[PDB]
Amino acid sequence: ELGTSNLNLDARNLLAYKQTEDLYHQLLNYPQEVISIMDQTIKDCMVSLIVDLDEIETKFYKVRPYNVGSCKGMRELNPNDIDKLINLKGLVLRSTPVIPDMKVAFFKCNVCDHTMAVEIDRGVIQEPARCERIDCNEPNSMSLIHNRCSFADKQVIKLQETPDFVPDGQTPHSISLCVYDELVDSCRAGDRIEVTGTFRSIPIRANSRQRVLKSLYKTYVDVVHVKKVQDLAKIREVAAREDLYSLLARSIAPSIYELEDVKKGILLQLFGGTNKTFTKGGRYRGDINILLCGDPSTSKSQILQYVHKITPRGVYTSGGLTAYITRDVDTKQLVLESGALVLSDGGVCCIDEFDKMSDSTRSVLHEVMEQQTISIAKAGIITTLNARSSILASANPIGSRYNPNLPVTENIDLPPPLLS
Amino acid sequence: ALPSIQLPVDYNNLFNEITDFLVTFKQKGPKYMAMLQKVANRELNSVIIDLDDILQYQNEKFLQGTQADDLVSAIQQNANHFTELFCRAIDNNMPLPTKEIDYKDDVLDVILNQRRLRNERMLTELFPPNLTRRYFLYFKPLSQNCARRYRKKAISSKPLSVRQIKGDFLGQLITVRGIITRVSDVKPAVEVIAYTCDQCGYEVFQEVNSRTFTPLSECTSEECSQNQTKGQLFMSTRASKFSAFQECKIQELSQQVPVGHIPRSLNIHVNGTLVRSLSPGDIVDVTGIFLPAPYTGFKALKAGLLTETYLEAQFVRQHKKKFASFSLTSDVEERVMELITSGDVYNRLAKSIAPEIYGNLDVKKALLLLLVGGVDKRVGDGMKIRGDINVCLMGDPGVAKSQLLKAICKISPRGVYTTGKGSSGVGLTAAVMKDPVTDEMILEGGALVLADNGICCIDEFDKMDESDRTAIHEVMEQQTISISKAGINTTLNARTSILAAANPLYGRYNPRLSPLDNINLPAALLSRFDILFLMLDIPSRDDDEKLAEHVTYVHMHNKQPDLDFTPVEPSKMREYIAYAKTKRPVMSEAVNDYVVQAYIRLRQDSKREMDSKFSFGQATPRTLLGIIRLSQALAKLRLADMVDIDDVEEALRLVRVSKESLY
Numbered sequence A: 001e002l003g004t005s006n007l008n009l010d011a012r013n014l015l016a017y018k019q020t021e022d023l024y025h026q027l028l029n030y031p032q033e034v035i036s037i038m039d040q041t042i043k044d045c046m047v048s049l050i051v052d053l054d055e056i057e058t059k060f061y062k063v064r065p066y067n068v069g070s071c072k073g074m075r076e077l078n079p080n081d082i083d084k085l086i087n088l089k090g091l092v093l094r095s096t097p098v099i100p101d102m103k104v105a106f107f108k109c110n111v112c113d114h115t116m117a118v119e120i121d122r123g124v125i126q127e128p129a130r131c132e133r134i135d136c137n138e139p140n141s142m143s144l145i146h147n148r149c150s151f152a153d154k155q156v157i158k159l160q161e162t163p164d165f166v167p168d169g170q171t172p173h174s175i176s177l178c179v180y181d182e183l184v185d186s187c188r189a190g191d192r193i194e195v196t197g198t199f200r201s202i203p204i205r206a207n208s209r210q211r212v213l214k215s216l217y218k219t220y221v222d223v224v225h226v227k228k229v230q231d232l233a234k235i236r237e238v239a240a241r242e243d244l245y246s247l248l249a250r251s252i253a254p255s256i257y258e259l260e261d262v263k264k265g266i267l268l269q270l271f272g273g274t275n276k277t278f279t280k281g282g283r284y285r286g287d288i289n290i291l292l293c294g295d296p297s298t299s300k301s302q303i304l305q306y307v308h309k310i311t312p313r314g315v316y317t318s319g320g321l322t323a324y325i326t327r328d329v330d331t332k333q334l335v336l337e338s339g340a341l342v343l344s345d346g347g348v349c350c351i352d353e354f355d356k357m358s359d360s361t362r363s364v365l366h367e368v369m370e371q372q373t374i375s376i377a378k379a380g381i382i383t384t385l386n387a388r389s390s391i392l393a394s395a396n397p398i399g400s401r402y403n404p405n406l407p408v409t410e411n412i413d414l415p416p417p418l419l420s
Numbered sequence B: 001a002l003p004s005i006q007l008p009v010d011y012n013n014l015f016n017e018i019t020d021f022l023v024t025f026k027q028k029g030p031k032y033m034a035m036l037q038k039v040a041n042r043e044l045n046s047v048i049i050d051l052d053d054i055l056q057y058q059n060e061k062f063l064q065g066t067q068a069d070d071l072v073s074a075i076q077q078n079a080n081h082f083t084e085l086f087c088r089a090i091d092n093n094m095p096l097p098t099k100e101i102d103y104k105d106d107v108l109d110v111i112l113n114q115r116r117l118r119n120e121r122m123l124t125e126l127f128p129p130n131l132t133r134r135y136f137l138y139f140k141p142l143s144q145n146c147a148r149r150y151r152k153k154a155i156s157s158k159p160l161s162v163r164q165i166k167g168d169f170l171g172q173l174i175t176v177r178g179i180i181t182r183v184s185d186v187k188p189a190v191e192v193i194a195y196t197c198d199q200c201g202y203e204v205f206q207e208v209n210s211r212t213f214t215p216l217s218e219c220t221s222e223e224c225s226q227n228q229t230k231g232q233l234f235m236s237t238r239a240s241k242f243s244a245f246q247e248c249k250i251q252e253l254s255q256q257v258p259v260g261h262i263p264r265s266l267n268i269h270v271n272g273t274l275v276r277s278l279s280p281g282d283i284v285d286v287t288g289i290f291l292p293a294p295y296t297g298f299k300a301l302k303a304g305l306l307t308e309t310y311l312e313a314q315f316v317r318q319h320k321k322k323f324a325s326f327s328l329t330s331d332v333e334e335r336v337m338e339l340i341t342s343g344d345v346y347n348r349l350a351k352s353i354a355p356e357i358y359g360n361l362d363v364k365k366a367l368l369l370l371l372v373g374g375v376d377k378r379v380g381d382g383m384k385i386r387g388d389i390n391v392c393l394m395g396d397p398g399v400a401k402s403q404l405l406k407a408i409c410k411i412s413p414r415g416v417y418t419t420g421k422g423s424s425g426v427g428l429t430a431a432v433m434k435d436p437v438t439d440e441m442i443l444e445g446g447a448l449v450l451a452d453n454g455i456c457c458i459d460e461f462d463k464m465d466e467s468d469r470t471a472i473h474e475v476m477e478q479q480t481i482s483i484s485k486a487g488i489n490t491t492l493n494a495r496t497s498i499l500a501a502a503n504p505l506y507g508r509y510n511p512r513l514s515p516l517d518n519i520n521l522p523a524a525l526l527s528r529f530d531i532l533f534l535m536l537d538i539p540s541r542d543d544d545e546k547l548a549e550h551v552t553y554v555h556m557h558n559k560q561p562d563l564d565f566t567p568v569e570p571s572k573m574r575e576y577i578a579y580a581k582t583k584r585p586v587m588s589e590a591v592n593d594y595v596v597q598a599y600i601r602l603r604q605d606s607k608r609e610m611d612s613k614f615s616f617g618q619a620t621p622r623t624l625l626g627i628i629r630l631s632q633a634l635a636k637l638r639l640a641d642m643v644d645i646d647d648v649e650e651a652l653r654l655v656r657v658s659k660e661s662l663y
Ligand SMILES: Nc1ncnc2c1ncn2[C@@H]1O[C@H](COP(=O)(O)OP(=O)(O)OP(=O)(O)O)[C@@H](O)[C@H]1O
Pocket: B356, B357, B358, B359, B395, B396, B397, B398, B399, B400, B401, B402, B403, B501, B547, B551
């Protein structure tokens, strides 16, 4: 009734039956053929259960086994576990763009402009040495077309082990991944995922000029399933309460004693004002910017840490902050990279240790608040970036204590216009 | 062609004697049949051969005038040949399995049975024996006492240095000694490579012992041998036989290096079940076969006679020491019973750490309290608390604080010593950055050296630049380091105790306001530390006399003098620190009122911090938190699961003594 073609399968339920555990053992040893025959079985299950046959013929079917074996570690991978299904956890390091993969070769007899489709196997192409049209039968008239073939979307993912497997200060190890179709772009940098798939070993080419091969094989894994690691009525019931303001203000900092007014101010800043962009007059700022000052006996960093995670979007940094053209490490190209302040568009940007801001960056702030639009002109690139971000900053006084007699300006060591 | 020469060695008698030894040897019956029986039942995975047994068997059979030659001498002269002789002898004399076998799991044997039921049914190929083999063969160097048993000089062993190995030791069995530095990962190595023939009779096999490999093009299948092609042969991954491969390099010890030289290295190959038996950073005694390696892999067409050399491991003695993670044993149980009988322990422990440094009992007591750690494992509603204690030591140069730090690092297995630059890969960068030969850019991002449950020790705390200062400020209060450079955010969960020693820039204490000397560091960083000590050198007769007498008596005996009186030993402290950490007392509420009024009096002192000249008595909640942690550590060091008011009193006294050094 949905039209979706995807079947999840857990091994423990598959293990719950006595005839199925034999198929379990056979699947562990020989995954590919078992999966193919299972997919054919599911394909026939369409007609077996419907007895519209039009939506069935177009779609293929696949399974997603998981929880087959226990999660192992990259530090114990014997050669005895080649071409066997295993379960692995880890953290994604880097990705790669989609890699086309030939599936159907296209050839043309240029003399008579006759074309044919040639299926392939194991990558190697058996080229036809003479055209099928015996009316011409020329041997050397074939030249393939690169843009009229058919391709598959392969992608390679680099994965590292979890730090839990390293007890004595050793270094992590990285294992390559391969994905197809729906698993493309299913993860990005920094993801914590668990994968189940078979093991593969390949000989390396070494010298591309010759047919010599090394005595060692590269190891990589191919996976089939990946896992990660009407309420509006509930609002108006709460929103209609009279004392919701006080409870809402006090809820965002359960451990903070007193300091109610500053909590109300921070909560209201998180709520944010309106933003309007009337044409004949221009846009008006809608962001709210708050400073906190005092001696380092206030736990004022805790409030910043609270508000960084409470807000939907927000970057927590310290005393670089904006866009700079970077030189890519792994790949030899030049990529424009955005800064932390740009990444906090619509949210609240948290800044700690505001006094130690150097001098070059301060002017940057001086243009991100009064205009909320940063422009960069470097390496032939001239452009403007929207920021539209709120600022919540904290600073410390000069000396062991902030003397009440002395005014604020001297102790904080900030430019009077920026403070104003 | 090739001229021929005569040698006294013939392998027929050697093989016959090998078989006779393997069959008749009595050390349960024969031992060498027990190993073969366990191998047959798929129980044993590798076979170890002891040369002492061969030597003593030959010696004891020499009493009868039948034996004519010796085998161990030929073993020492050449080793690789006897490996295949031994494997052939084992394959010839493999007894039948006396135990049941889960036969369905051996997919290799199942595939071979399918191939045999294909071919022999028609009425077949004689497969190479090594493909059928499942065991590994290892040698063990003899022992010196066995050589001493007899007159002959069957010595071997003798763990030569790296540079002591010359060009005349190629092909022999030699033992080396050194420190392991680099260890690579585990990767499969091919032994027998199989191709499928596209359903054309037998599937061709091939074995390559070289470090390079070339594939086949055509096959000997009869219908494929027919004058037209029938299917392209393809390599089969399942049918092939593989083996674990690993490589490592070993460096010479600093004691064996001749003066004015640079230590050399040596490459070691290891295969089989011995893989992953060694770790970087240990002293080992490796015995193996010293083999040459061709230079043709580099493909330079130079060095017509020059070749590279490597050692193939055969037996490894890990040596060094074992931490054992205080695994409980009977003997250490009687040891802790003795400690229980010893009464009060921490004073003796303080007396017994660094007797070479005279006096300074309170500093050693603070070190003991640092070793156990404070209150930890979190509190309600997710608030973070760490058991780590941060202590900074102040004093003039020449007070043996650096030596005390070195002694602490020696006694603490997690201790690490760092300093401002000098070595770059110790702060803010991973130790594996740009390390692999492939330049894979392996990195965690923002991390320190073993900062997880480590004891970081630093000298010249004012020396470090802004980067290491930022790192030490980032590792504050178990805060993780989240410095990113290329999208990496694999943060290192830093939970470490910080111990640092520093000095004022004047090099001597000053009569003026002591905070003007401070650390020459920001006051925010100063307030983080739990305990501050100041060791000021006061010239006096009645103490410098004792110090000079102690130093000169140490110098006269060229050892730690008997003038020291310590009932407890460094390994005993190493055991007891883990034992007392295991006990882990928890907090008792009955001290809440007392600690609250103590904090009230601390703020009363804060009401007099403007009196100046020792203004360090400032107001900070971290003072109270450190008081709680120090009381918890005082309960932890000796007491059972209970925190006493005496712990609070001792923590207060320690704080007052810490402040009293200001004067
Ligand atoms: N109490 C002591 N007992 C014995 N020797 C001591 C003592 N105090 C200092 N020494 C001597 O001082 C030397 C070690 O102190 P050292 O000068 O290295 O420490 P430091 O105060 O950290 O100074 P620096 O920064 O100059 O290295 C040794 O030669 C040691 O014999």
